[PDB]
Design a protein around this motif. Structure first.
Motif, mmCIF file in Angstrom:
data_model
loop_
_atom_site.group_PDB
_atom_site.id
_atom_site.type_symbol
_atom_site.label_atom_id
_atom_site.label_comp_id
_atom_site.label_asym_id
_atom_site.label_seq_id
_atom_site.Cartn_x
_atom_site.Cartn_y
_atom_site.Cartn_z
ATOM 1 N N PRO A 105 -13.784 10.830 25.434
ATOM 2 C CA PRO A 105 -13.665 9.528 24.772
ATOM 3 C C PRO A 105 -12.784 9.596 23.533
ATOM 4 C CG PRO A 105 -15.973 10.145 25.142
ATOM 5 C CD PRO A 105 -15.150 11.368 25.352
ATOM 6 N N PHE A 106 -12.019 8.538 23.284
ATOM 7 C CA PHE A 106 -11.240 8.411 22.060
ATOM 8 C C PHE A 106 -11.915 7.369 21.183
ATOM 9 C CE2 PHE A 106 -7.172 9.843 24.478
ATOM 10 C CZ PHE A 106 -7.522 11.181 24.281
ATOM 11 N N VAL A 107 -12.090 7.709 19.907
ATOM 12 C CA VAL A 107 -13.072 7.044 19.059
ATOM 13 C C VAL A 107 -12.461 5.777 18.472
ATOM 14 C CG1 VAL A 107 -14.613 7.405 17.120
ATOM 15 C CG2 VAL A 107 -14.045 9.315 18.624
ATOM 16 N N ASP A 108 -13.082 4.620 18.751
ATOM 17 C CA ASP A 108 -12.457 3.341 18.408
ATOM 18 C C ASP A 108 -12.890 2.695 17.083
ATOM 19 O OD1 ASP A 108 -14.840 3.178 19.805
ATOM 20 O OD2 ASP A 108 -14.338 1.343 20.882
ATOM 21 N N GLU A 109 -14.182 2.313 16.928
ATOM 22 C CA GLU A 109 -14.759 1.528 15.819
ATOM 23 C C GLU A 109 -13.997 0.217 15.578
ATOM 24 O OE1 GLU A 109 -17.834 1.846 14.300
ATOM 25 O OE2 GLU A 109 -17.311 -0.012 13.286
ATOM 26 N N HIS A 110 -14.261 -0.807 16.405
ATOM 27 C CA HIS A 110 -13.459 -2.034 16.387
ATOM 28 C C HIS A 110 -13.669 -2.884 15.127
ATOM 29 C CE1 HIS A 110 -17.048 -4.369 17.422
ATOM 30 N NE2 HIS A 110 -16.324 -5.467 17.301
ATOM 31 N N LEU A 111 -14.817 -2.771 14.458
ATOM 32 C CA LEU A 111 -15.067 -3.536 13.235
ATOM 33 C C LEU A 111 -14.804 -2.670 12.001
ATOM 34 C CD1 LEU A 111 -15.884 -6.544 13.240
ATOM 35 C CD2 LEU A 111 -18.159 -5.822 12.493
ATOM 36 N N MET A 112 -13.562 -2.184 11.892
ATOM 37 C CA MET A 112 -13.213 -1.321 10.764
ATOM 38 C C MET A 112 -12.973 -2.099 9.477
ATOM 39 S SD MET A 112 -13.234 2.039 10.549
ATOM 40 C CE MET A 112 -12.364 1.920 8.998
ATOM 41 N N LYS A 113 -12.717 -3.405 9.565
ATOM 42 C CA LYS A 113 -12.559 -4.210 8.360
ATOM 43 C C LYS A 113 -13.884 -4.512 7.670
ATOM 44 C CE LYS A 113 -10.750 -7.020 11.223
ATOM 45 N NZ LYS A 113 -11.540 -6.463 12.354
ATOM 46 N N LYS A 114 -15.014 -4.381 8.369
ATOM 47 C CA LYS A 114 -16.307 -4.523 7.710
ATOM 48 C C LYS A 114 -16.682 -3.252 6.956
ATOM 49 C CE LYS A 114 -17.751 -7.924 8.603
ATOM 50 N NZ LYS A 114 -18.896 -8.519 9.342
ATOM 51 N N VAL A 115 -16.135 -2.111 7.370
ATOM 52 C CA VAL A 115 -16.362 -0.842 6.685
ATOM 53 C C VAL A 115 -15.571 -0.763 5.380
ATOM 54 C CG1 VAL A 115 -15.985 1.663 6.932
ATOM 55 C CG2 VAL A 115 -17.010 0.357 8.800
ATOM 56 N N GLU A 116 -14.277 -1.100 5.407
ATOM 57 C CA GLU A 116 -13.422 -0.929 4.234
ATOM 58 C C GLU A 116 -13.531 -2.056 3.218
ATOM 59 O OE1 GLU A 116 -10.001 1.723 6.434
ATOM 60 O OE2 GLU A 116 -9.749 0.783 4.465
ATOM 61 N N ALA A 117 -14.327 -3.094 3.479
ATOM 62 C CA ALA A 117 -14.546 -4.120 2.466
ATOM 63 C C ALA A 117 -15.463 -3.604 1.364
ATOM 64 C CB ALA A 117 -15.122 -5.381 3.110
ATOM 65 N N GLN A 118 -16.642 -3.110 1.738
ATOM 66 C CA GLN A 118 -17.557 -2.479 0.789
ATOM 67 C C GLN A 118 -17.543 -0.964 1.004
ATOM 68 O OE1 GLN A 118 -19.135 -4.045 3.527
ATOM 69 N NE2 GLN A 118 -19.394 -6.198 2.942
ATOM 70 N N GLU A 119 -16.529 -0.317 0.424
ATOM 71 C CA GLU A 119 -16.394 1.135 0.512
ATOM 72 C C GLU A 119 -16.137 1.836 -0.814
ATOM 73 O OE1 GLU A 119 -14.616 3.405 4.343
ATOM 74 O OE2 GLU A 119 -13.205 3.280 2.668
ATOM 75 N N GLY A 120 -15.421 1.221 -1.750
ATOM 76 C CA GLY A 120 -15.059 1.888 -2.986
ATOM 77 C C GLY A 120 -16.180 1.942 -4.003
ATOM 78 N N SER A 121 -16.890 0.831 -4.155
ATOM 79 C CA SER A 121 -18.001 0.718 -5.089
ATOM 80 C C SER A 121 -19.298 1.133 -4.391
ATOM 81 C CB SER A 121 -18.067 -0.706 -5.646
ATOM 82 O OG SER A 121 -18.838 -1.546 -4.803
ATOM 83 N N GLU A 122 -20.438 0.795 -4.990
ATOM 84 C CA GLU A 122 -21.718 0.919 -4.311
ATOM 85 C C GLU A 122 -21.793 -0.077 -3.155
ATOM 86 O OE1 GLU A 122 -24.628 -1.416 -5.169
ATOM 87 O OE2 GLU A 122 -26.022 -0.418 -3.803
ATOM 88 N N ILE A 177 -19.081 5.891 15.712
ATOM 89 C CA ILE A 177 -19.168 6.200 14.290
ATOM 90 C C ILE A 177 -18.055 7.173 13.911
ATOM 91 C CG2 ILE A 177 -20.714 6.867 12.416
ATOM 92 C CD1 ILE A 177 -23.064 6.200 14.180
ATOM 93 N N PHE A 178 -17.042 6.663 13.170
ATOM 94 C CA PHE A 178 -16.132 7.468 12.367
ATOM 95 C C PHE A 178 -16.907 8.197 11.269
ATOM 96 C CE2 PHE A 178 -11.846 4.979 12.869
ATOM 97 C CZ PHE A 178 -11.508 5.762 13.963
ATOM 98 N N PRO A 179 -16.447 9.407 10.836
ATOM 99 C CA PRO A 179 -17.080 10.100 9.706
ATOM 100 C C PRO A 179 -16.612 9.655 8.317
ATOM 101 C CG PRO A 179 -15.425 11.497 10.678
ATOM 102 C CD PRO A 179 -15.536 10.306 11.575
ATOM 103 N N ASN A 180 -16.636 8.339 8.060
ATOM 104 C CA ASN A 180 -16.429 7.847 6.706
ATOM 105 C C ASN A 180 -17.318 6.669 6.328
ATOM 106 O OD1 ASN A 180 -15.032 6.083 8.415
ATOM 107 N ND2 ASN A 180 -13.009 6.602 7.610
ATOM 108 N N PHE A 181 -18.323 6.326 7.132
ATOM 109 C CA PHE A 181 -19.287 5.330 6.681
ATOM 110 C C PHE A 181 -20.711 5.826 6.907
ATOM 111 C CE2 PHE A 181 -17.484 3.971 10.815
ATOM 112 C CZ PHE A 181 -18.602 3.715 11.611
ATOM 113 N N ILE A 182 -20.932 7.120 6.668
ATOM 114 C CA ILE A 182 -22.289 7.624 6.499
ATOM 115 C C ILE A 182 -22.866 7.077 5.195
ATOM 116 C CG2 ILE A 182 -22.177 9.631 8.016
ATOM 117 C CD1 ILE A 182 -21.386 11.319 5.580
ATOM 118 N N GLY A 183 -24.077 6.534 5.272
ATOM 119 C CA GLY A 183 -24.678 5.828 4.166
ATOM 120 C C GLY A 183 -24.571 4.320 4.256
ATOM 121 N N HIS A 184 -23.731 3.807 5.149
ATOM 122 C CA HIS A 184 -23.660 2.371 5.371
ATOM 123 C C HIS A 184 -24.848 1.928 6.215
ATOM 124 C CE1 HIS A 184 -19.276 1.239 4.299
ATOM 125 N NE2 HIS A 184 -19.571 2.378 3.700
#
Lengths: 59, 97, 72, 125, 72, 202, 145
Positions: C1-18, C32-39
């Motif tokens: 499988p090639f890893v997609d995550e189609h709702l990536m704009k919901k991840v990068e909206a609340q990512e920099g702050s808490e 699950i991409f390895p950059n929204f652990i804790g979401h």
RNA sequence: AAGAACCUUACCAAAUCUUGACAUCCUUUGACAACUCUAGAGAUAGAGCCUUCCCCUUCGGGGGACAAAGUGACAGGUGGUGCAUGGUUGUCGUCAGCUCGUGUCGUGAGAUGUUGGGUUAAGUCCCGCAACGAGCGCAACCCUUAAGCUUAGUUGCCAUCAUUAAGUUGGGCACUCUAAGUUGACUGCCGGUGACAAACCGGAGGAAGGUGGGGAUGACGUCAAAUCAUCAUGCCCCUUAUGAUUUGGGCUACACACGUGCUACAAUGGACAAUACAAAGGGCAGCGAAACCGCGAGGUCAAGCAAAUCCCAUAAAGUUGUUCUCAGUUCGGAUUGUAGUCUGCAACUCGACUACAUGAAGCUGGAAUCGCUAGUAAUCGUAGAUCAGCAUGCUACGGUGAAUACGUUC
């Protein structure tokens, strides 16, 4: 049921939900898509003779 | 040599076309080979006979498609006009080669 | 499988702050991409939205081994 | 000198050439060894040459296809009996008291459309 | 033989590459520790490690009895 | 069950009701044949057509219409076939040509008397009177045997029966017997009465 | 019921040996059957030095009985027609040559054949067992079926 | 249900809509609108953009064909009822039975025909008789197989030849193959038993001998058997729902009892290498040639084919040599985990498969019970459909391939 027949004669969200119906009644299963005919209406038009094709069980 | 792929379902319309086209090429030309038949492998559709229950009884419908191959060796220019002139089988499928 | 995550704009909206409390997805197919652990997701098993916290080690799996729907 | 015959059993076509020789079963002109898995049963097909004991030193030439190997061996047995038919008209009763021109119609029977495996009705409870 | 005396004991099985074979890959019972650490990581298909349904599906309705008992 | 004779005798002695070829597409011919048969089903309410036969040769269709009342497909002198043919040209977007023939001995084919008996049972007649007068008016033309089974809620009955008035030879198992068959439904106020006409004529 | 026949094999020249070939097979395997019978026949030639038609013919008469019981509600001593006699003797020879527990079939059927000439095994014990059941139940009838 | 990631889906949580998802009438507009972007899970709203009179009229029309409103008549229902139904199908049962006209007998219900003798597969015949005849069913005129021939030789076959990795082309249709048709299998001839009639048995001819083998074809009716879930209907009920669309579950759950099928429980075998053989069927977004790197699931350029050419396609079991040396094993292949491959917005509930490793019962199945008389059983592959991807199930073909049937006693 013309609900799903009125639904599936339209272009959809994907191209993988284009499942096969009979184009005469609303039957979804056993649709011979070479004919686009179902299990029952292909038997009825085979017995009336309005498909060009014989019945021979002589294999 | 040109070939036609004379393709019907039944034999009742392929024999009249194979008598028409061959003798049209004989009376307008010379050395046309006959309607050489294919094995005509068929398509069997096997359904259940019933509506709701009962896969214990079923029903066969086969669809045979007869094919003859006719070769015209050294085709005269009257033959390629006179084969396409009269067209009355009304249900055979002709391919030209 | 090639890893997609189609709702990536919901991840990068609340990512920099808490990151905000609980954000929901109506798709268990979002790999699950390895950059929204804790979401903290609310993922849908059919009945309602069941919460899941993406802790430390579930990068290689989906959102569907979590929030079961066959109960017992 | 070259008796071109035919013969079949169980979807196995056979076309013999009876030539005078010492005798070797040359199936697809190869051998008797590699083609047939019955190298012990190499006299099942030799049956018209041992039931007609006029001469049993005759060479066969085939290059043939069809079916399996037991049915192809009885098909070239039918071709040997057909070549002995077309070789001499006085062999025929020497055929017919042993049979051997009897084409057996024992083919694999058709799959019956309600039953599972062609007289294998699928286990009533 | 030598090559089929090693298929049921741990480490090597039946189709690997071959007093010389004493060394190489993970030939001891540390793979049992890695399998137990992976089932500790999932304990999330630990809801079906009491059953016999994997990550890639079972259809357990009448037969999943090899992680179960005879009658039980 | 009793199989129908028109199933058993297509490709034995009686030809099919469609004569064309299609291999590649094959669903864009038969379903347009179904909608053109459904469009001749609108003029079946007055015209009494037994069957149409599709002759798609290469581009245009010499469709062979067989009505027992031949003077009311054509109109006065040929107007109704032309406005019908323009309506078929609208409703299949292909070329058609109406080939009419005038078939008398109207009480010898099954579809004309099947629609006639279903018409008489729509009009709340008693079924035995139209059944006996249909089989005796088919024998006074000269026939070799007429089975006529009407079934269902018989004359506004509570329990369905199967009134069959068989007469003479209707030999369904001798396979060189060209047996006409039609089943025509009758939409009565007390339900749906299916007729079933099985005429053997040698 | 006319009970038609198959041709004899020309390796060991008898018609009983092709019935043994057709009896020892399983799942239609005739080549496996010819692989395990002719090597058992050559093990017979290398162990006890005599041609195996004689010792096989003399060993199949130590398995074959003359009485048979068929019960009906009972036991009668009906004499047996000889094709039924020889197919039950061959079927007892295979069905106790399948249950010895040895290395291969070629050392399983062959020493059972040479035990049937020395009146031991399981087959001659089966002939004395059907003679014991036909002699202990001799008393009930001579007439029933 | 011969295809359950979304769809199917009716059911269920949410988002919603009410001329509605759709059929049709009328008014207004009009060669329709597709495609990118924002919210959202999408359905849905909102931007760019006109596709914007195509048939044709003076400007305006008419209207093939679309869209919005009024929501007005209408929708729609896989809602209930198969015990109102048609249509369709199972079982008795491919068993040989079932009825009618006329006449007679009988107060009559009814019987006779249809029974008795012989016979077969048969109510198939023949004899005698208040029966005479007829109709559905059995028997075939139907198809296939089983043997040549008239005919026609290509993509198929190679007599005889040149010649190659290849029948691959030159030539030919010798044989084979293939098919529109021809001749044949019809107790037809002889003998015996036969009432001299039906037939039975044996022999000969024939490839096939006694309906040659197999299929279709299923009588009158029975089970108020199944289907208001293909469809329509007869009644009832809702129509800001029981109608509609979309995302996520779902039919794809187990402490289970049962039915069908596969795998085996191994030496007949398990593994390795060479080598043989065919039928039947399909293919255009499909069949993926060779070659290639991959242990491998597959992926790359890719000839050819709208089909005897090209592909699926090595069919598998067999044979020759080697190992294992009788065991829960060198059998198995369930399970778990990791690396993955492919379809497809996607394999978590839930697809197929490869590698590695773990290797769980299973060492032959009791009471009972199922299927089968000849190419049958058993076993082993191949192909089609459904299918965007999915089979031990259904269908169809082929390889190897036995005995039993004294009888019908229960």
């Amino acid at each position: 049921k013309t609900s799903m027949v009125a639904k599936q004669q339209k272009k959809q969200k994907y191209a993988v939900r284009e499942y096969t119906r009979c184009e005469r009644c609303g039957r979804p299963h056993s649709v011979y898509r070479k004919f686009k005919l179902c299990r029952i209406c292909f038997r009825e038009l085979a017995y009336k003779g309005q498909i060009p094709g014989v019945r021979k069980a002589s294999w | 040599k040109i070939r036609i792929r004379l393709k019907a379902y039944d034999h009742r319309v392929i024999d009249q076309s194979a008598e028409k086209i061959v003798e049209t090429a004989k009376r307008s030309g010379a050395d046309v080979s006959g309607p050489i038949p294919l094995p005509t492998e068929k398509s069997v559709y096997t359904i259940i006979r019933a509506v709701h229950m009962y896969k214990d009884s079923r029903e066969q419908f086969e669809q045979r498609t007869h094919k003859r191959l006719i070769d015209i060796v050294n085709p005269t220019p009257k033959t390629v006009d006179a084969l396409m002139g009269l067209n009355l089988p009304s249900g055979v499928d002709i391919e030209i080669k | 499988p090639f890893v997609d995550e189609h709702l990536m704009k919901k991840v990068e909206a609340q990512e920099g702050s808490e990151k905000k409390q609980v954000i929901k997805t109506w798709s268990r197919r979002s790999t699950i991409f390895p950059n929204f652990i804790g979401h903290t997701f609310a993922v849908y098993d059919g009945r309602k939205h069941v919460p899941v916290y993406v802790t430390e080690d579930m990068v290689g799996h989906k959102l569907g081994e979590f929030a079961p729907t066959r109960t017992f | 000198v070259e008796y071109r015959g035919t013969g079949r059993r169980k979807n196995s076509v056979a076309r013999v050439r009876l030539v005078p020789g010492e005798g070797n079963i040359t199936v697809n002109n190869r051998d008797v060894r590699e083609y047939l898995p019955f190298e012990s049963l190499i006299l099942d097909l030799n049956q018209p040459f041992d039931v007609t004991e006029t001469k049993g030193n005759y060479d066969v030439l085939v290059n043939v296809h069809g079916g399996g190997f037991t049915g192809q061996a009885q098909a070239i047995r039918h071709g040997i009996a057909r070549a002995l038919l077309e070789a001499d008209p006085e062999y025929r009763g020497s055929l017919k008291r042993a049979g051997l021109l009897t084409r057996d119609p024992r083919m694999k029977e058709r799959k019956k459309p309600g039953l599972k495996a062609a007289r294998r009705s699928p286990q009533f409870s | 033989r030598v090559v089929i005396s090693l298929t049921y004991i741990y480490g090597i099985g039946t189709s690997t590459a071959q007093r010389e074979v004493v060394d190489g890959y993970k030939v001891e019972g540390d793979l049992r520790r890695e399998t137990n650490l992976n089932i500790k990581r999932l304990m999330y298909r630990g809801i079906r490690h009491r059953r016999g349904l994997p990550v890639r599906g079972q259809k357990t309705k009448n037969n999943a009895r090899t992680r179960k008992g005879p009658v039980k | 069950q009793k199989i129908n004779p028109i199933g058993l005798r297509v490709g034995i002695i009686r030809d099919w009701e469609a004569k064309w070829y299609a291999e590649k597409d094959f669903a864009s011919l038969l379903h347009e044949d179904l909608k053109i048969r459904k469009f001749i089903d609108n003029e079946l309410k007055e015209a009494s057509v037994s069957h149409v036969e599709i002759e798609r040769a290469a581009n245009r269709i010499n469709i062979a219409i067989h009505t027992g009342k031949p003077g009311m497909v054509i109109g006065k002198g040929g107007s109704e076939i032309e406005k019908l043919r323009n309506k078929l040209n609208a409703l299949t977007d292909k070329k058609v040509h109406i080939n009419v023939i005038e078939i008398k001995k109207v009480d010898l084919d099954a579809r004309l008397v099947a629609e006639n008996i279903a018409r008489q049972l729509e009009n709340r007649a008693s079924f035995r009177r139209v059944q006996k007068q249909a089989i005796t008016r088919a024998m006074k033309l000269g026939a070799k045997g007429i089975k006529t089974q009407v079934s269902g809620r018989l004359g506004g009955a509570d329990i369905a029966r199967a009134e069959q008035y068989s007469e003479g030879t209707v030999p369904l198992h001798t396979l060189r017997a060209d047996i006409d068959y039609a089943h025509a439904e009758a939409d009565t106020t007390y339900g749906k009465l299916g007729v079933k006409v099985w005429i053997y004529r040698g | 019921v006319p009970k038609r026949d198959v041709l004899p094999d020309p390796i060991h020249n008898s018609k009983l040996v092709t019935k043994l070939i057709n009896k020892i097979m399983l799942d239609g395997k005739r080549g496996t059957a010819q692989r395990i019978l002719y090597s058992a026949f050559d093990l017979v030639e290398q162990r006890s030095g005599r041609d195996a038609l004689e010792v096989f013919e003399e060993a199949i008469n130590n398995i074959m009985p003359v009485l048979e019981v068929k019960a009906r509600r009972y036991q009668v001593p009906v004499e047996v027609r000889p094709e039924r006699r020889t197919t039950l003797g061959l079927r007892w020879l295979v069905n106790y040559a399948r249950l010895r527990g040895e290395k291969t079939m070629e050392d399983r059927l062959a020493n059972e054949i040479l035990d049937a000439a020395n009146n031991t095994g399981g087959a001659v014990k089966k002939r004395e067992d059907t003679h014991k059941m036909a002699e202990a139940n001799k008393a009930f009838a001579h007439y029933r079926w």
